[PDB]
Design a protein around this ligand. Structure first.
Ligand SMILES: O=C(O)c1c(Sc2ccccc2)c2cc(Cl)ccc2n1Cc1ccc(Cl)cc1
Ligand SMILES: O=C(O)c1c(Sc2ccccc2)c2cc(Cl)ccc2n1Cc1ccc(Cl)cc1
Lengths: 258, 256
């Protein structure tokens, strides 16, 4: 049903624009130099970055990694608003909505982080800043190897040259996964995903006509994505049992993990 | 189009050549069809001893490792039949096998499995899921993810002709860590994906987005492998005296 697959795509894109203040288009305009980000390439610029840039968020490697978590928690609420705009989502059993978000959000976080990344570093504070990949590697060794696999993933993901229109449908596909553990009613979830997959496939065909098997290549990117998430959780589980620099009891409660 | 049906059939024939127990034969065994013989059932320590013909948990885990070496050989033989594979850089041939072999082992183990157990010794035996759960920690947990995957994967109702192409798609992954020449591998996988999409459309005409759903299962496959390497490390930390096959040591060296 081609025309309402197109309407679904347009609806998702419009909701994506509504929910996500920094889009890939804007992020790319900055990364390609096509305003300008304050650059964090060393400890000096880091310290100067912290004073100039708001950082609405107590020693460097920790300051950075905690800041990342604070920002991810913010992203969870953006992803949640977006999910609720996916037709059918808010009428799912509430338990199932929670389950799909519980497992979906991490995956979406790394997908959207790729939009902010290139081989040389990552956009931070809504494109107001740019932290270099070298500066991150230079860090403190449980922390120098924490973003590296994300840069690896991002470089291969970004080679697909997806745009916001593509990503809006791909993110929806991720959320409506009938394979999440503990789901009560898989039927409407798979029904919704079926239509999203059809919309994604058409979108990719129209948006990237010269791009053979792009649908398949993208779906298989989900394998590396889940691996990133899995290995990131066990890095958090290592970081916790070992890191003393992680009210604050009230803060801990908000940012514990999402 | 081109020539995707010939490619599909070549892969199917090479798969039949390389793997001695097909899903069709496995299913005929599991469901009591008269084309095939019924299996001996291992369901407790008693029947295990009579099925075999010093601690059982280690001996079973070790038995599985050993059949996995045979599986690695069968898969390598199959990979050579994949058009373009033998033309790739030698180091890349090694990398693709290194990372692909276990995802293939788990795909193919699903063929041997139902919710209640797994075919063993080329389908001559059947070992119950409940018996495996009864093994000593940390050996009572090691097959569970594989059964959980098998049940979900088997719901796709793929046959051997579908699986032949899927396994080839798995091996020809341009995203494997440490590949030197990614382009020629993606060129090959492009053709395999085209063949797979067409095969599922013709073989499963009433099954919507089966192609997408199958590809999505590669995500589960990777997580089985990831979680298996974790378990091996727990085994490493907590057991002694266990030998390991050079093929396996080699695959597992620097694996995730
Ligand atoms: O607050 C930020 O914008 C930020 C941060 S917070 C921060 C950045 C630099 C120095 C100290 C804190 C961040 C940290 C890392 Cl290691 C990687 C990416 C980071 N970002 C960008 C980011 C964007 C989106 C999401 Cl979900 C997570 C992080
Ligand atoms: O030799 C076998 O056929 C076998 C074995 S070996 C074995 C089985 C029962 C008692 C003693 C050894 C095996 C063990 C587990 Cl835990 C699970 C599946 C197993 N199988 C079936 C099997 C099929 C294929 C692959 Cl690559 C690995 C194992």
């Amino acid at each position: 049903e081609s025309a309402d697959l197109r309407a679904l795509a347009k609806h998702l894109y419009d909701s994506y624009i509504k929910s996500f203040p920094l889009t890939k288009a804007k992020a790319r305009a900055i990364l390609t130099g096509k305003k300008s980000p304050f650059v964090i390439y060393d400890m000096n610029s880091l310290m100067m970055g912290e004073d100039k840039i708001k950082f609405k968020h107590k020693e460097v490697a920790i300051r950075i990694f905690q800041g990342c978590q604070f920002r991810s928690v913010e992203a969870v609420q953006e992803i949640t608003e977006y999910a609720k705009s996916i037709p059918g989502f808010v009428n799912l059993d509430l338990n199932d909505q929670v389950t799909l978000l519980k497992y979906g959000v991490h995956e979406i976080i790394y997908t959207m982080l790729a939009s902010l990344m290139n081989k040389d570093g990552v956009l931070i504070s809504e494109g107001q800043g740019f932290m270099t990949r070298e500066f991150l590697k230079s860090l403190r060794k449980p922390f120098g190897d924490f973003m590296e696999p994300k840069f690896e993933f991002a470089v291969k993901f970004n080679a697909l040259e997806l745009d916001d229109s593509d990503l809006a449908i791909f993110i929806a596909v991720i959320i409506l996964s009938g394979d999440r553990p503990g789901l009560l009613n898989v039927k409407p979830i798979e029904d919704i995903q079926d239509n999203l997959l059809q919309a994604l496939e058409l979108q990719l065909k129209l948006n990237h006509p010269e791009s053979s098997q792009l649908f398949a290549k993208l779906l298989q990117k989900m394998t590396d994505l889940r691996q990133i998430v899995t290995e990131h959780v066990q890095l958090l589980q290592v970081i916790k049992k070992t890191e003393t620099d992680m009210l604050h009891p009230l803060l801990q409660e908000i940012y514990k993990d999402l």
